[PDB]
């Protein structure tokens, strides 16, 4: 088919569309909800479960459950239902007349890819498919060849150093600190002021609060000293019922745990330290082009002032002679999808799909020896 | 053809050009590298190998390999690739419409010259060719007729005593100490300060450090005593990644192993003793002109103060009545190519080529009987 | 004193004892852990740090840090604490009334030895001391005089060719691939099955499973083909919490990085190839005894079937006429300590110590001129 489906499936969001476009047409949260109450009324549609915005609208009754956890798929029936919703009820295109493109984080269990390709070749009967790393697709979107990518989505944060068309597999780091931990920490620290949120429906509200009211502080101690005279930092948010919530230092305390994982109990290095270490694991004469090309991807990298603090933190480690620049495109959120769409439409790539006949003979193990 | 090709082919560098000029136009390292990594990106030219500066600029990915070792050519396909790069992509001239001149170190395996002739007559279809010793060409460059030449390049160091128009083949010495062992010894003793270099790419960095930061000391014990108060000898170098490396007595410890091969494990004599022994092997009535005419050639002899120490070392052995003079032209590096260009353009030499029809009947054995 | 301490200090383990014995009485891991948590309870022992087994038993709380990295001591205070624990709280012997013997890998920074002497002479006030290479001590333990020793410990692997009482310093090779890289690679490849270990307390568990469940395969591709029908290779291990972990081809995949360093990205040759190159670096008339005397030392050389593969690989390189034998004593781990104890008790060696009055005049620089 001339147009191929590219369906990026992250840990928190589902973004799908067609190859060759610029922005996806189908974007929605990747949750599945089920009723947990009596259901006295008769004659109303007794749907077993709701997926996507249909569940986000009635979360008040349901019990939302994310099928993807830290990139790992736990419940596969929910994943099949979500894929069905993307293919039929959201994109209105049959899957057996188009090839599909998939994304999956590096350093992941091998059974995940085999089960993904088995599902897509059995329950959907697609003609071809291909799985690609998020970081290489994000680099494809930026129209570059050398540099490192810090992809920070909802479940995993990882780095992939890429030189002029070549990848270094030994320098690929991966830490399991992501947006879900940020939301959990915000929920935990919001009880100091008195506001308590427990259920998944309230977890969605806390995530919404984090999305549009939190910023990264360039300096932490100075900002804390400024917030000590709590006059110019407190904002307000509106609850669905009508109550007003005010927060102070939690605007910058919550996003700082990326740079200081010790706050949430993890013993590890911050994102700046991880990317510096990933730089240092490469050769010596290719470190300059990595320093000069720092690409920010993912949805968690949209906090205001993140780049201005990352530059200072990395400069504090790198030698003074080198110059440091981080790339902050205005379209961080859909960079992986844009790169996948660009790769799918390329005329060179169309000979590296996985045809149905090849899987019929090589079996599900074809992904490991044909995709990476 | 009025203008003949002269492509001097040393063990470390390739310098090619046109007969009749003063300096070669094509000079570049003689290395061939190959990728060793994944190659995940598509659409970028997947070249199998890179030759010359194209590989020197990307050494960070490849694994560089010198095809010529101690003057002995081990891999012939790499040599064919090197010659192809010299002729087509760097000199922009056809090889089948020009005659070529080649150089090789004396006391060499007989297979090398016949293989070179066969390759040049089969894969390139040259009309004529000729092979000559480096030392005699270096003598030609200086415009002299009597004297000895110490050629010290990258793989071999040798001597050729020459009286008026005649050569003494029994007095030709050859020791296998050259620049490569110098870089290896510098790498070995550079670990004392903590800096460790292992791979080939770092070997090039160490070679660059040696080329512009090492000098020959007139006295060794006095210089070591001076460096004991390590204040006035330390310098600094800038690594590609930005780190600063400082070295002390390693500036003069490394170049001395030419005068003292016992440091690097070999139980032989130094270059001064080698040239003195080569002088003494000739007749008695021709020694004075040899003492008065000492010609220094090659790239290894570019260390500052080498002539001042060689003069003292040779004088300490020779009888006090005789006078010692060593010539150190500002253009040691390209003396062999200059002499080759001078000889090629000479009208007398135009009868000592090797015609293609001569090779068609004599076979590859014509070189041994028509070149030396 | 009649009895002298021989306190061997490797990069992963500390083994100390008394001269004249057969096995050391003091063996413990060389780690220093510090608390990282609140410490709400009052009245309990608030020790700043724990050393040795006292920290190995409470790793669940602490953050262990190795003071020695690749033979180089980075943090000197931790080394002082470890030596204090070794002398007082584990051996119960005052250090000022006994002489001590130390070991250190070759081709090491010069500051290391002099700082070690300075520590031992200022902050312990020992009467005399001496440092020695591990390989020569391992040869001493075996009761031989000619042969090469491949010492493979935790941080460094090195070779020392030894003829009849003489050492060839130009043939000493050293690669930085050792057990720590083995553990890191095992951690990296253990995540394919789903199990992920990140913390140092989990690094200890990974080292433990590596120690007693991994073996070296004689043939790699045949073993992979056998493991394809994964029935007869899988084993089971018990993590402390209670779960079960089972692995397949990881039993032999990780050991093999000694022979194929390209798996971990390093551009070097295998240990067999480094040993062969070190053999070929010597003279021609001494290679026979080196071939006929191969001594294995270190703790990394205890993988089952290592000798059966090393002998095959070495025979595949050496000429067929020569016979190859490899010594695999049942006491590889403590061979260095045994050799040190043997040498310390020797009567001839008694005149080669470093007296305190000599250090008071010559200074810390006496080690370089009186030890090697
Ligand atoms: N404007 C924003 N400000 C702060 N955080 C955001 C914003 N938009 C999204 N996020 C965070 O990004 C996460 C979603 O990342 P996502 O784009 O789904 O990555 P992926 O598609 O790779 O899973 C959410 O958990 C949310 O907390
Ligand atoms: N300026 C310099 N100072 C010191 N050594 C040099 C310098 N330039 C070149 N060399 C040494 O000379 C070697 C190259 O010699 P080269 O001119 O290629 O001889 P040939 O052409 O006969 O091979 C290099 O290995 C390098 O170590
Ligand atoms: N039984 C065993 N099997 C496999 N590996 C082992 C075994 N015992 C120890 N090791 C390895 O040896 C290393 C320790 O070496 P060690 O004896 O400390 O050398 P050194 O004392 O010279 O530092 C550890 O990293 C461990 O992985
Ligand atoms: Mg993403
Ligand atoms: Mg030369
Ligand atoms: Mg050891």
Residue numbers in the entry:
A (entry chain D), B (entry chain A), C (entry chain E): 4 to 373, 376 to 377
Quoted passage from the original study:
Myocardial force production is derived from cyclical interactions between myosin-containing thick and actin-containing thin filaments. Thin filament-based regulation relies on troponin-tropomyosin (Tn-Tpm) complexes that span the length of filamentous actin (F-actin). During diastole, the inhibitory subunit of Ca2+-free Tn (i.e., TnI) binds to F-actin, and constrains Tpm to the B-state where it physically blocks and limits myosin attachment. While the association of Tpm with F-actin is highly dependent upon electrostatic bonds, both short-range van der Waals (vdW) and hydrophobic forces also contribute to the total interaction energy.
Here, using recombinant baculoviruses, human wild-type and A331P ACTC were expressed in Sf21 insect cells and purified via gelsolin affinity chromatography. We therefore carried out cryo-EM single particle analysis of human wild-type and A331P ACTC filaments to directly resolve potential molecular aberrations in the surface strand that may account for the elevated diastolic contractile activity. Both wild-type and mutant F-actins exhibited similar overall features in cryo-EM micrographs, consistent with the mutation preserving filament formation function. Using the helical processing workflow in RELION, we resolved actin structure and connectivity in wild-type and A331P filaments at up to 3.5 Å resolution, enabling us to build atomic models of the complexes. Overall, both structures were very similar, exhibiting an alpha carbon root-mean-square deviation (RMSD) of 0.536 Å between the two. Direct comparison of the atomic models of residues 320–335 from wild-type and mutant ACTCs surprisingly illustrated that the backbones of their surface strands were nearly superimposable. Thus, cryo-EM reconstruction alone did not resolve major differences in the orientation of the ACTC 320–334 strand or in its individual constituent amino acids’ positions. Therefore, to investigate potential A331P-induced changes in protein dynamics, as well as possible structural alterations not readily resolved in our F-actin reconstructions, we performed MD simulations of wild-type and A331P ACTCs using models derived directly from our cryo-EM-based maps. Thus, our F-actin MD results suggest that wild-type subunits, and importantly regions of the 320–334 surface strand, appear to exhibit greater mobility than the A331P mutant.
